[PDB]
Structure formats: C-alpha cells, structure tokens
A paper describes a structure:
Three S1/S2 heterodimers are assembled to form a trimer S protein. S1 contains the N-terminal domain and the receptor-binding domain (RBD) that contacts with the host cell surface receptor protein, angiotensin-converting enzyme 2 (ACE2).8,9 The RBD adopts either “down” (also called “close”) or “up” (also called “open”) conformation, and the ACE2 can only bind to the RBD in the “up” conformation. In addition, we developed a panel of bnAbs against Omicron and other SARS-CoV-2 VOCs and demonstrated their evolution over time.
To investigate the interactions of ZWC6 and ZWD12 with the S protein, we solved their cryo-EM structures in complex with SECD of the Delta variant at 2.8 Å and 3.0 Å resolution, respectively. Focused refinement was performed to improve the map quality at the binding interface between the RBD domain and ZWC6 or ZWD12, resulting in an improved local resolution of 3.5 Å and 3.3 Å, respectively, which allowed accurate model building for side chains of both nAbs and RBD. In the SECD-ZWD12 complex, three Fabs molecules bound to the S protein in a closed conformation, whereas three ZWC6 Fab molecules bound to one “up” RBD and two “down” RBD in the SECD-ZWC6 complex. Structural comparison shows that the ZWD12 and ZWC6 nAbs bound to RBD similarly. ZWC6, ZWD12, ZWD11, REGN10987, and S309 fell into a group that competed with each other, and they all blocked S protein binding to ACE2 except S309. ZWD12 exhibited the highest neutralizing levels against authentic Omicron virus, with a slightly lower neutralizing IC50 compared with S309,20 whereas ZWC6, REGN10933, and REGN10987 failed to neutralize authentic Omicron variant. All mice in the prophylactic group that received 10 mg/kg ZWC6 three days in advance were able to survive lethal challenge without obvious weight loss, while those in the therapeutic group were partially protected. Interestingly, ZWD12 was able to overcome the Omicron’s antigenic shift, while ZWC6 and REGN10987 failed to neutralize Omicron.
Numbering used by the authors:
A (entry chain H): 2 to 121
B (entry chain A): 27 to 67, 81 to 140, 159 to 172, 187 to 243, 264 to 621
C (entry chain L), D (entry chain M): 2 to 106
E (entry chain C): 346 to 394
C-alpha cells in the first residue's frame, strides 16, 4: 500500500487550499478513509470521514462548515478542500484508512506521511 | 556382522509321541537359511514374535536374559539369571541398569523361583504362557555357528500374563533370530525324535515335498500351487463433476433482508465448498452445532437451506437453539435438533448511514412465541389489554414493527450485523449436494481394482470396439458376468478382462538324480510371472 | 467514548521491561492499535487489533488486555526505543487517539 | 418409592414443543398416568399407562418413556394449555403423585 | 492381604491335585455360589485352566 498527500504551504487567514490524497496499491474503493491533524507540539486528533462514496460524511468540532471532504474512485483520490481558514489550524495533516466494507475485505491499515500547512 | 543359519531352530511343537510319521505342522519357526545377527563381547533388542538364541563358550559369559516392554518400573517384566550357583527366575517390577551385568529394585514380585559348547534356546510367549525350549550340543569349535540338525526340547512353562516387546542379555559370541509362521515337514525316528525336516517355502523342490507329504519325490510332474497377479490401487471413475454451486446470491448480495421477513434459499445439485468459506478470517461468529466445521468438505447432504438477514450486535447470541428474546421468541426460532452452522459478521460499513438507515425493522411485540422456521408478515394493530382498541392508537395500541437506527457513530453491539444461517437435512435423497471430492484418473492394461459409479470389480481394462447403443449402460455376458462398461465422464466402452490366475506345476527329474527343478505357470503369459 | 493513557513519562533504562495501559470510556473489544511516534516522524503503527503486531515489528513488542483495559509490553527493546505511544480504537466513528505517554531515562 | 419431576417452571409460547420428565425411586413399568390441573379445577387425567391417552384428549398429547424415566410431550398444544402436570404410579400401594411442574410464558 | 478392586489380583493353576470338598465344608462362607457347575461334581471333573 502507498499514500501520497499534497497541498501544503503558507496561506493567509481567509483563503483556501486543495488538500489532496492519492492512493494506489490496494483498491481505493471498498475502503473508508479519513484525515487527522497534529499541531506541532501536541498529540493527535482527527478531522473528517468519508464512507466509500459520498452518502455519509461525519465531521469534528470547529471544522464543520469550512471543510468539504469528497472522494471519487473514478479518479482514485481524496479531498478535504480547506476553505476560508483560521490562523490557528496551522498543522500537519495525514490521510489514513479506517478499513473494510464487505466480509472479504481483509482489513489492513496504513498512514500517509504528512502535509504541512501554515498561516500568516 | 550377520551370518547364515543352515537348518537350526527346530523344536518339538508339543507332547505326543510318533514313529516314522512325516508330520506336517504349521507354527512359528526360524526359516531355513536365514539372516541372523552376530554379536561379540549388549543392546536392547526387539521380540515381536519369539526368538532363537544360540551361544558358544567353555566359560560362562552368557548369564541369562531379561525381558519385558519397558525394562523398568511402571510396568512388569521377567528376569532370568544364573550366578555360579544356579538359575533364578523372577518376576517383579524392577529398575534395570541401562547397561546391566545388579538391578536396583525388586518391587511387587508376582513370581519367584530359586534353586566348546553350543547352547540354543527358543523363547515364545502365547496366551499368558512364556514357553522356553532349549538344547545343549557340544561343538568341536570354540565360538562360531556350526552346521547340522538338532531339535530343541521343551524346558519350562510360566503362566505369567506379562506383556513383552523387548529383551536383553547378561554377561560376566551370540546370535539372534526371529520366528515367523511357517509350515514344516518333520521326519520322526522310530524312537520318536525329529531327525530331519523340510521348510516348505524355500524353493520348488521343497514346495513339492510339502504338497506330497514326503521326503522323496519320484519322477513326474506335480501341481504345486498357483500364480495370481496382484492388483494395486483402485480407480473410481465418475460422470462429469456437475456444478460449482455459487452462493453469491447468499453472501455477496446487494442487500440482505429485515428479520421479520427473513429470506431463504435452498440448494440443488451442486458442488458446495466449505473450507474456503471458513478460512477468510473475518467472521464474528462461526458456530457449528450438529456438525464439526472440518467434516463438511466430505459429507454429502440431501437438502441445504440458507437464511439471511440483518440484526443488531447484542442479539447475535439469540440465534442459537434455545434462547429467549425479541429475535428468537418471535422473529427467528431455531429448532433444538439443529445441525447447521450460524455465520455472522459485522456490517457497520454497508448497512449504516449518518442520520440513520431505517430499512431494517423487527417485530417487537407478538401474541406469543413463533415455532421454528415460520414467519409472520401480518402487519396489523397491536392490542394491549381489556380495552377494545382494535385498530386505533394512542391509548396503548401499537404497530408492532419498530425500525432500527443504524449510524456509524453508535457503539458496537448497537451496529448492524449480517447473519447467514445454514441448515441441513439427510433422510433418503440418493444424489444431492456434496463437497469438493477427488478420486483418480482411469488406467488401462493393468490388473486394477475399479469402481464405475456403483459397479465394483477387479481386472484389466481395455479399449473396446462394441457399439454400445446410445442408451446401454453396460455389457452383459451369457452366465451373467459384467464384461464391458461405459466411462461416465468420456462415454467410451471398455472391456473388462479378468486378472491372470493359474496353477503352478513343478517338473523334477527325481531327487535321486538331481535337485534342480523347472516351473510351469499354466496358461499365464510369461511377461507377468513375478 | 474517549481514550486515556494514565501512566505519565517513565525513566526505564535500555533494559528492563515496560508496561503501558490504555483505558476506554465504554466497552471496546479487539479494536485497538498502537503507534510509536519519534520526535518529528510519522506515527508508525505497531499492533493489529490487540493481539498481532504488523510486519517489521519484532517479537519483544507484545499487545494484550481486554474488556476496557489494554496493555502494551516491551520485554527488552534496545538502546533507542524511546518515543511517545498512542492507543487508537476502530470500533465506531471516528478513531480517537487518547493522550500519549513519553519515556525518558 | 417416591416420584419426582425435576424440570421446574418453563416459558414456552403457545407454539413450539414441551417435554416433561418424571423419574421413580425404583423400577416401575407401564404404570404411570398424567394429570393436568388448572388453577382451581379438578385434576383431569391424560394418559393410560404410559402409552394411550384417554377419551377427550387430542393427539398432540403423547406419553412415552420406560424403565424409570418417563416423558410427556406437547407437540403444538394451543393458546391455553398451561397448567400444572403430575405423574402418578399404580404399581403398588398407594399412588404417589410427585411434585409437579408449572408452565408460564 | 488381598487387593483393592480397581486392580484385582489374578493367579492361574498348572499341574495340580486341587481339592474342592474340603474348601466348601468349612461352614464360614457368606456366599458360595456355583453357576455353570454343581458344587458336588468338582471332586471329579478335570479342567484345562
Ligand atoms: C466433462 O467435462 C470435460 C471437461 O471438464 C469435457 O471435456 C471437454 O471435451 C471437449 C470435447 O468436445 C474438449 O473440446 C474440451 O477441451 C474438454 N475440456 C477439458 C477441460 O478438457 C467433457 O466433454 C465433459 N463430458 C461430456 C460428456 O461432455
Ligand atoms: C464474494 O465475492 C468475492 C469477490 O467477487 C469472492 O472472492 C473471490 O473468490 C475467487 C474464487 O475463490 C477468487 O479467485 C478471488 O480472488 C476472490 N476475490 C476476493 C476479493 O476475495 C468470494 O468468494 C464471494 N463469496 C461468495 C460466498 O460468493
Ligand atoms: C542381512 O540383511 C542385511 C540388511 O542390510 C544385509 O546387509 C545382509 O547382506 C543380509 N545378510 C545375508 C546373509 O543375506
Ligand atoms: C544367586 O542369585 C540369587 C538371586 O537372588 C540369590 O538369591 C542367591 O543367593 C545367589 N547365590 C548365592 C550363593 O548367594
Ligand atoms: C506396586 O508397587 C507400587 C510402589 O511400591 C505400589 O504403589 C503399588 O500398590 C504396587 N501394586 C500393588 C498391586 O499393590
Ligand atoms: C499388552 O499390550 C497391549 C497394547 O496394545 C494391550 O492392549 C494389552 O492389554 C496388553 N496385555 C494385557 C494382558 O493386558
Ligand atoms: C533309538 O534309535 C536307535 C536308532 O534309531 C536304535 O538303535 C535304538 O534301539 C533306539 N532306542 C534306544 C537307543 O533306547
Ligand atoms: C536311486 O538311488 C539308488 C541308490 O542311491 C541307485 O542305485 C538308483 O540307481 C537310483 N535310481 C535312479 C533312477 O537314479
Ligand atoms: C503376452 O503379451 C505380449 C504383450 O502384449 C504379447 O505380445 C504376447 O503375444 C502375449 N503372449 C501370447 C502367448 O500371446
């Protein structure tokens, strides 16, 4: 399995940024993915979830309404679409896999390697 | 080293006298010209069926044997000893030195007794009696096995009961033969002693002497035995497999059903695999009740039924024969004599939706329990008590089928589980679903043991040229013996010739001329003799 | 449903054994996974589902515990395996990571 | 010679089948009789002598068993047949009735 | 001493002259029950084991 994330940099408090997560190896459909942030000097905490097609997206606190996660298995990637941001969620971001949809899905887990976003 | 006996290890099979009577016997003997171990001077040997045992010296280095199964405590053994005084038979539980030449324990004794040269012994153990024959001949050598004939006379008889599997020796040159069931021809003197013998399974001359019951055969030709080719293995042809029997409409469906109206599907002519379903290692509950999960891959059935639905997590235990609760009292009752397997797995990633997925209802109220393996879709009102409501609401009336709420943000035990229940039955259907089987291809031109979908037989199979009318299963021969078959799979006719068999005759110029012999295998093709 | 790791920083030498405890607010069964995050790396996962560790993790890492109390044990790691550790659940949505426990000397 | 009925109260719905066991202190053969006593009625007899029920008792009532262990079976009674049941012997003197087994829902 | 019943002892008989009347008439036996033979014919019938 492999996961490659992109869309980091420096922004202003009130812009947008394409947070994209590309997957290969394992089949990207039949599999539940999500994101997780970490502010540098803290622990770990999650962002948003998507359920193998867009029918059900759950959100976390204080990110509901600025964050529209979407997947599309006809081009096998994942998006957060950070939009109209704050100057306090400068962090690192990881796309990870929750796992499993059917009985034959052999649940394995994997993580990315981080995408850094900073504000002004 | 190993050495060759010549004619050694003959004992009087019993009491009784006899004068000049070529007495034929069947017993345990040491075959003539055998392969006898050689020992110098010792280790633990086997017993397995009697023992011949010779020894040579002028001093006395061989000082008895020790017998038994373990040669220690925890089981009983015999001990036969001789110091410079005299013999000491003994039967206790011992503790034997692994290299003994004294012991170290004498517990629970159940039998006691106290009181160059060639010294032969035959030891045997039948029906709790331990028999010992012996003979003491004087050699004119010191320590090599000589040649000659000398019959061994019975010495002892011990009603012990002891089991024996091993034995040893005791020291202060010896051989060890073993005994097999043979047939001999003993020549008795006029005083009643055995002076000569014939082993009747050595060569053709000896088999002739045994057939005639004599020691001198006159010229002629004698039928002595039979040959019969031997068959190996045993094919088991069978008509084209059949199917693969998919259950993708059981497990791999697009949606299961609700538990108040559980779906069902029977199985017909199939080849149903069961090991490949079990080893996927993702199943919450795989519980087989009347059968073990390892025997399916081999037992035919007569009908298989699959039920399938969705229930919550804290009621998967309710799908078991003899539970209680809203899923087993009146939604899905299992009978007590069940024999199938309950399979269930968590499905929180298909049948779950944020905001809820309310397709999956269940009865929560019923007049009473619903026997096994029926259902009810009688969606009506529910009535509470002594009031007549009968289809109103509000004042304790109801609709007794409540939906489930399945969101992923709900703890386990309150999550959707997909349940598949398998049930079997076996009464008298002669050809129904069986698991992945395997026999072996067919062979030709070899005496074989065959089974053609029921026809069991033996013989050589050969390509035929008899036009079996499209509807004739096999070939019938006058006097009614099967002589042709049709292969179910490829549908070709094959003749079934019989496996060779025939008499064996021995041609001899007479023992007063020569001991050479020729052998006739009667009407046997000379390429299949051995 | 919130995780917690109650033992704080420890000072176990390169040797000896370490035992780390993770609770849960309600009943979670065979659904935890352990992560070992160095200073400034990606959090590498350790243990599938309370009992079997993944590939590339040695035998001295062991994971056990049940009910609502779970435990990771280092038998005799080595002279480096000092980082922060996290316990995560995959029971429902979403996977909470808890607090974390450092180790020092 | 004392009878006993070891299964206690049961909760079998109007459907399903029920199986009730009666022992004996010594060997009694084909000498038992079953009674079904409602709340506050006369105990109505069921089965002559371990095998044939009397008149006015349907076929779903069956009685079997032998040696010293005897059994009454309800195949699929109805929505009322819930009472106490008794096993009695007529081997010698006198006829002991045992303990009794209720059924509920 | 006799043995316990889980491991009962046993002993066979070989060439002998076995008396049987003198064992019976001691008149101290709780149970003397002969099944396949009468207790008065032993004093005369040979056996094999
Ligand atoms: C039974 O099945 C076998 C295959 O399992 C059939 O063999 C085929 O025979 C045809 C001849 O018409 C060949 O062209 C195919 O290549 C064969 N298949 C294989 C896999 O070898 C056989 O014909 C079947 N029996 C009958 C009576 O049709
Ligand atoms: C359900 O569907 C899956 C996928 O369609 C089946 O799994 C496949 O089984 C075949 C035959 O054994 C294999 O060649 C494939 O590699 C399997 N794929 C996967 C992803 O496992 C599964 O057997 C089906 N189960 C049932 C009961 O129909
Ligand atoms: C006895 O059998 C052994 C087994 O290998 C063999 O080596 C030896 O030659 C045999 N001796 C005789 C005399 O046939
Ligand atoms: C010879 O050995 C037996 C074995 O117990 C022993 O009883 C006997 O006393 C020995 N002979 C002498 C003279 O001690
Ligand atoms: C055999 O000996 C052991 C140990 O001395 C003893 O426990 C056992 O009881 C003995 N056997 C009998 C039948 O008494
Ligand atoms: C001898 O060993 C066998 C082992 O197969 C056992 O079955 C048998 O009972 C033993 N002999 C006696 C007399 O118990
Ligand atoms: C024994 O046999 C020999 C020769 O067969 C005979 O001469 C003798 O009389 C027989 N009887 C004896 C030696 O007592
Ligand atoms: C048989 O043997 C005797 C003596 O050994 C001999 O005189 C005779 O010629 C033999 N008979 C034949 C047919 O060889
Ligand atoms: C024995 O079999 C071979 C092989 O088929 C054959 O050539 C030969 O003719 C057969 N023997 C006779 C007597 O026909």
């Amino acid at each position: 399995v492999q996961l490659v994330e992109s869309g980091g940099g420096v922004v202003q408090p009130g812009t947008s940024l394409r947070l994209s997560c590309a997957a290969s190896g394992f089949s990207f459909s039949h599999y539940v993915m999500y994101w997780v942030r970490q502010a540098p000097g803290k622990g770990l905490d999650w962002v948003a979830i998507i359920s193998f097609d867009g029918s059900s997206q759950y959100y976390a606190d204080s990110v509901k309404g600025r964050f529209t996660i979407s997947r599309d298995n006809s081009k096998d990637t994942l998006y957060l679409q950070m939009h109209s941001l704050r100057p306090e969620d400068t962090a690192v971001y990881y796309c990870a896999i929750h796992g499993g949809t059917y009985y034959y899905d052999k649940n394995i887990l994997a993580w990315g390697q981080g995408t850094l976003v900073t504000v002004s | 080293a190993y050495t060759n006996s010549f004619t050694r290890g003959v004992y009087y099979p019993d009491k009784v006298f006899r004068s000049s009577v070529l007495h034929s016997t069947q017993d345990l003997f040491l075959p003539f010209f055998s392969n006898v171990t050689w020992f110098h001077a010792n280790p633990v040997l086997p017993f397995n069926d009697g023992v011949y045992f010779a020894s040579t010296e002028k001093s006395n280095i061989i000082r008895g044997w020790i017998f038994g199964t373990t040669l220690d405590s925890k089981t009983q053994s015999l001990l036969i000893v001789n110091n410079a005084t005299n013999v000491v038979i003994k039967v206790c539980e011992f503790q034997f030195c692994n290299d003994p030449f004294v012991y170290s324990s004498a517990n629970n004794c159940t039998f006691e007794y106290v009181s160059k040269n060639l010294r032969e012994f035959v030891f045997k153990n039948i029906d709790g009696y331990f028999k010992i024959y012996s003979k003491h001949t004087p050699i004119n050598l010191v320590r090599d096995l000589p040649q000659g004939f000398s019959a061994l006379e019975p010495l002892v008889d011990l009603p012990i009961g002891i089991n024996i599997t091993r034995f040893q020796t005791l020291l202060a040159a010896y051989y060890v033969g073993y005994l097999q069931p043979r047939t001999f021809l003993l020549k008795y003197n006029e005083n009643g002693t055995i002076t000569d013998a014939v082993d009747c399974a050595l060569d053709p001359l000896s088999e002739t002497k045994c057939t005639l019951k004599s020691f001198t055969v006159e010229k002629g030709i004698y039928q002595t035995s039979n040959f019969r080719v031997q068959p190996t293995e045993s094919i088991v042809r069978f008509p084209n497999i059949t199917n693969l029997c998919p259950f993708g409409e059981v497990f791999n469906a697009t949606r299961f059903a609700s538990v108040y109206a559980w779906n069902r599907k029977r199985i017909s002519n199939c080849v149903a695999d069961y090991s490949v379903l079990y080893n996927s290692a993702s199943f919450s509950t795989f519980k087989c009740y009347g059968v073990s999960p390892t025997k399916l891959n081999d037992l035919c059935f007569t009908n298989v039924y699959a039920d399938s639905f969705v229930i919550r997590g804290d009621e998967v235990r309710q799908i078991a024969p003899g539970q209680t609760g809203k899923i087993a009292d009146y939604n899905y009752k299992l009978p007590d004599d069940f024999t199938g397997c309950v399979i269930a797995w968590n499905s929180n990633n298909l049948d779950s939706k944020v905001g809820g997925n309310y397709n999956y209802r269940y009865r929560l109220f019923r007049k009473s329990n619903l026997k096994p393996f029926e259902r009810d879709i009688s969606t009506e009102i529910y009535q509470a008590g002594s009031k007549p409501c009968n289809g109103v609401e509000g004042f304790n009336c109801y609709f007794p089928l409540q939906s489930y709420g399945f969101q992923p943000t709900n703890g386990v035990g309150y999550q959707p589980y997909r349940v598949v229940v398998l049930s079997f039955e076996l009464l008298h259907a002669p050809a129904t679903v069986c698991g992945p089987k395997k026999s072996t291809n067919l062979v030709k031109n070899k005496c074989v043991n065959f089974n053609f979908n029921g026809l069991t037989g033996t013989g050589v199979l050969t390509e035929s040229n008899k036009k079996f009318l499209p509807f004739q299963q096999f070939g019938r021969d006058i006097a009614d013996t099967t002589d042709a078959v049709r292969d179910p799979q490829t549908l070709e006719i094959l003749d079934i010739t019989p496996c060779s068999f025939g008499g064996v005759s021995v041609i001899t110029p007479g023992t007063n001329t020569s001991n050479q012999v020729a052998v006739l295998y009667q009407g046997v093709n000379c390429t299949e003799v051995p | 449903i919130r995780m917690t790791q109650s033992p704080p920083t420890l000072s176990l030498s390169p040797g000896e054994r370490a035992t780390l405890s993770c609770r849960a607010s309600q009943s979670v069964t065979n659904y935890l996974v352990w992560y070992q995050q160095k200073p400034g790396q990606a959090p590498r996962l350790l243990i599938y589902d309370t009992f079997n560790r993944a590939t590339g993790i040695p035998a001295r890492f062991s994971g056990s515990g049940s009910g609502t109390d779970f435990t990771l044990t280092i038998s005799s790691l080595e002279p480096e395996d000092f980082a922060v550790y996290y316990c995560q659940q995959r029971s429902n949505w979403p996977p909470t990571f808890g607090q974390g426990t450092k180790v020092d000397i």
